[PDB]
Structure 1
Amino acid sequence: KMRDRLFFLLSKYGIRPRDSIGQHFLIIEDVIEKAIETANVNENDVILEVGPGLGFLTDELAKRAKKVYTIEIDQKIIEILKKEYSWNNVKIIQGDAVRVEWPKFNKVVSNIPYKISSPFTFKLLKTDFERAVVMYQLEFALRMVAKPGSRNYSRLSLMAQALGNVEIVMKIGKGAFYPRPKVDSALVLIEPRKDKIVLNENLVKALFQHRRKTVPRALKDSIHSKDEIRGIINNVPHSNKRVFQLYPEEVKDIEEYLKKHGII
């Protein structure tokens, strides 16, 4: 009946899905149910969806939340959402989710298009927010929940996990969308830590440039300074590890070491 509803709307509004903006519409009702459940949506919450699509998940958010802001790049979809839904509590915002100014919000419950998985996520992590539930292409969600010491551990993994408990909650097959995509998706929960770990971005970029290296060699080789600081390198914390083996905590030990020696 969500599948039936979808094909109803396709013909009705003569919709031509654009894969260039990742137009794969969700049509399994349980995935909406899970997302809502996981986000524990309530009558006080101000939600931020990206890419409302045919507005299925938006419709479910809107009837549970105080307010919903949703950011749609496709102006035609926006013309449809307005004519099909009667949302008293949804503000629709035309533009690129990455480019436009975000309004204030305490939870995210959205699909995240493939081509903005990385910018969106980094933008979200720079934000004050109580809970995110965001569906990603499966590789990217696997990267986000990679643990220190796996190959797919990277800057994203670190920067995410420094801010929140990051876990995959269900895996969603490609049969769950129309058009059918090339890849599976995952629903990811992000819970802000009380114990937030905040790290110098430039240092992280530096370390993770060649992340398969030792912390000392990675530092030696990442003078963004003065090369004449070999003295400090040998006493660097966590010198036995390689960068891809570091937790946010050990990265902070390295940061605080370099501040103490006025390298930052």
Structure 2
Amino acid sequence: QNFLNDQFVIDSIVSAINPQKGQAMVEIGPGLAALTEPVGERLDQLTVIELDRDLAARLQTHPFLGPKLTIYQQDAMTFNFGELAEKMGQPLRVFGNLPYNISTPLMFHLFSYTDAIADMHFMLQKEVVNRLVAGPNSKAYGRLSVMAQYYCNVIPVLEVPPSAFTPPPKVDSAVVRLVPHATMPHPVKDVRVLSRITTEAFNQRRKTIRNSLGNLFSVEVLTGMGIDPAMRAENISVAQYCQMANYLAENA
């Protein structure tokens, strides 16, 4: 719905993405081709996922983009990216102006394909980008920071005012780059457990982890790991959360 319309902003995003011939790029929500056109001009082929049948039909008749485009008229939420990576024969460079509504579930959907994604460049609500990148001991640090950082290097790109879109959104936007780790810095036996620990910790972020994770870790276990039970969810590092996930897997 909120179509990117500012030319300078557009140029700045294209410059950041830096599409190169030979890369397999996939846009989620090409819309009115604000990014599709300039990105596609640098490529021989380009894949898009577009739910609006009206706008998809306009891409197909673009004289230069058309011949280059593979258009999937489906929902990205349940799109099999892992299978698309197999077809393109290489990890995917994903990009797009994402609707605020689906942005967080889509990111987790993409994260689950690990290896299959080279990188991601998404427009999101600015506060979402701040959480994604946040480190411990700050307000923005939460479960999303930890999960997102387990999977990826999180790289803020641009902040974008409402006036850059037509119609304008109600809140500031930002572009973030997400790069799945080539080498996972803190591997976890089973991610569902990491997901569970962070949910429990952050659902009670104004309590010490002694209290919020007391159903899962004794004070002795926490002390043994070098984790201070007087600390709260937001004081615990990504590394420590992963150490807790592995413990709970190697011991329960």
Q: TM-score, normalised by structure 1?
A: 0.79
Conserved 8 A contact 1:70-1:92: yes
Query: Do the aligned partners of 1:46 and 1:66 also contact (CA within 8 Å) in 2?
Result: no
Quick one: distance in 2 between partners of 1:45 and 1:101? 19
Q: Do the aligned residues in 2 keep the contact of 1:160 with 1:166 (CA within 8 Å)?
A: yes
Aligned partner of 2:208 in structure 1 is 214
1:254 aligned partner: 244
Cα distance between partner residues in 2 of 1:237 and 1:259:
18
SS of 2:75's equivalent in the other structure is coil
Structure 2 CA distance for aligned equivalents of residues 43 and 233 of structure 1: 50
CA deviations 1:48-87 (Å, max 9, x no partner) are 2111111121112222234322111211111222234542
Q: What's the CA shift for 1:222?
A: 5.4
Distance 1:68 1:143 in 2: 30
The equivalent of 2:21 in structure 1 is 43
1:109 aligns with 2:58: no
**Cα distance between partner residues in 2 of 1:194 and 1:100:** 23
Q: How does 1:54-65 map to 2 (within 5 A)?
A: 54-65=32-43
Is the CA contact (8 Å cut-off) linking 2:59 and 2:66 kept in structure 1?
Answer: no
* Alignment check: 8 A CA contact 1:78 1:92 kept: yes
Percent sequence identity over matched residues? Answer: 30
The whole-number CA distance in structure 2 between the counterparts of 1:51 and 1:209 is 32
Structure 1 unaligned blocks of 5 or more: 1-22, 224-228
Tell me how many residue pairs correspond in the alignment: 235
What per-residue deviation string (whole Å, max 9, x for no partner) do you get for residues 182-238 of structure 1?
A: 122101122333441344333333333323332332222359xxxxx7764553541
Moved more, 130-139 or 199-208: 199-208
Question: Is 2:171 the partner of 1:192?
Answer: no
Question: Does the aligned pair in 2 maintain the 1:39–1:107 contact within 8 Å?
Answer: no
Is the aligned partner of 1:175 residue 2:163?
yes
Pick which of 71-80 and 195-204 moved more.
195-204
Q: 1: CA distance between counterparts of 2:40 and 2:121?
A: 16
Residue 165 in 1 paired to residue 153 in 2? Answer: yes
Instruction: Classify the secondary structure of the residue corresponding to 1:34.
Output: helix
- State the Cα deviation string for residues 121-142 of structure 1 (Å, max 9, x = none): 1122222222221111112112
Partner of 1:202 in structure 2? 196
Contact 2:60 2:69 (C-alpha < 8 Å) held by counterparts: no
Shift of 1:258: 2.6
**TM superposition score normalised by structure 2:** 0.83
Structure-2 separation of matches of 1:259 and 1:38: 40
- 1 CA distance for matches of 2:100 and 2:154? 19
SS at match of 1:56: coil
SS in 2 for 1:217: helix
Of residues 57-66 and 40-49 in structure 1, the stretch that sits farther from structure 2 once superposed is: 57-66
